[PDB]
Design a protein around this ligand. Sequence first.
Ligand SMILES: *SCCCNC(=O)c1ccccc1Sc1ccccc1C#N
Ligand SMILES: *SCCCNC(=O)c1ccccc1Sc1ccccc1C#N
Ligand SMILES: [Mg+2]
Ligand SMILES: [Mg+2]
Lengths: 5, 5, 236, 236
Amino acid sequence: FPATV
Amino acid sequence: FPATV
Amino acid sequence: GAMGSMERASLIQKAKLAEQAERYEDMAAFMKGAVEKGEELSNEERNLLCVAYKNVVGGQRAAWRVLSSIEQKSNEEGSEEKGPEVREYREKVETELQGVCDTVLGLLDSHLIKEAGDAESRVFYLKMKGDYYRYLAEVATGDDKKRIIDSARSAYQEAMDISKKEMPPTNPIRLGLALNFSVFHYEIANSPEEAISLAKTTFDEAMADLHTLSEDSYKDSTLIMQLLRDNLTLWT
Amino acid sequence: GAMGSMERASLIQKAKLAEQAERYEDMAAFMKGAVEKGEELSNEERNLLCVAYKNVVGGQRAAWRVLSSIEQKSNEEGSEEKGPEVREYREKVETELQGVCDTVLGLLDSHLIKEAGDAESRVFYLKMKGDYYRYLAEVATGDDKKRIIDSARSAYQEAMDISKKEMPPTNPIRLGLALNFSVFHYEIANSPEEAISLAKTTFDEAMADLHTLSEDSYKDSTLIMQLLRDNLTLWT
Ligand SMILES: *SCCCNC(=O)c1ccccc1Sc1ccccc1C#N
Ligand SMILES: *SCCCNC(=O)c1ccccc1Sc1ccccc1C#N
Ligand SMILES: [Mg+2]
Ligand SMILES: [Mg+2]
């Protein structure tokens, strides 16, 4: 999965 | 801590 | 509310203890109680609220994905019928996840967003609103799915508009918002080109502004820039 | 009970799904419901019950230790007074931990142990009884602390007596029981010499019996023997 913050 | 199962 | 009798300061103190103990459900309950005192949240308090619910919903999302994968495999050709249990349990986790998202969205709507006037608070809360609608969108399959997706988009878009007017391109909130909205485009809105364009432009405009920063601000900004780069590498 | 309306087989199936999803509180609730159907548990079902509660209580114990450490530091000389919150929150986690232990002990007493006639089931349940009294002992500081410790000792001792009569020295249940009773001696009963002697003798008697085992049984037994060795290395 792509990075989120 | 020591090992337990 | 069960936290109604506890002092605001005690709720915040216990939220910090819960974080140290990795008790994120407790941390979220304490921060919900703190929000419900009705006062605005400081920068540190906003980040405690965000950390608590991000960890709770993150665990729910991970579990939902495991169960959804199992359910998908059970519906493949040649798979043995195992009854309603996989769907039931996936639905149980899904309903709990939706409940958490509804709780966070409820705190934002009553009344964090409407009292947030400074860019740092308002962008932060609108980003969170986009995030929690995005988590609802990840599990949505009904008539309202398009409206859920549009609610995420609208919140992200308002946050973007404010952030571009009021914050420097290296501001960590602005950067994290762009990172997440880019993920929304890629994963939710079927818009990979918009996702890539947003990540690239955000990265490049931040790069050009790093020269203005102290060493500590530079560390904060470059950390998130690396996340943008990581997504670009994954997507290209 | 909230699981009263769900089929036994469905509860077991969902416990396995919860394990895959790392949802150990759910897993424990499903297995509690399965136990409360009143039928004896198979080997696999006993291990699901054990895994679920071991993970739940393990997380509680880790959190309790973090909070207890903070509380101890707050009571050192020169420490600033921060109010009752650390003690309150440690007490909250402690009470939840005790509740889980009481639940497990209640399942064992009503009525898993009394129906367990084979060594493999009876030793397993008595070991669990010793384990959950041991977790209660870790947090005990009141008038009943000695009785809690003796309850753990008594359960472990009955399990040991059965295991030595009825199981080979390499049996994994016998080995895990000895490992845990040895830890009880070292950590709870202030008996490090007994802990070391038990671990050494268990290891050596298992070593001498490995020649009787298949490759797969050998792997199971040597895994636990290495845990005994790890504790001996820590303690000597
Ligand atoms: S959920 C806790 C929020 C704190 N950090 C974030 O995850 C976040 C959220 C929104 C936008 C950016 C970031 S990363 C961040 C935030 C504030 C200060 C520095 C950094 C970094 N790096
Ligand atoms: S909590 C789940 C119980 C399964 N394994 C254990 O943790 C355990 C419990 C009691 C005694 C020994 C062991 S380890 C074990 C158990 C059964 C079969 C093989 C092994 C190993 N190695
Ligand atoms: Mg649903
Ligand atoms: Mg107490």
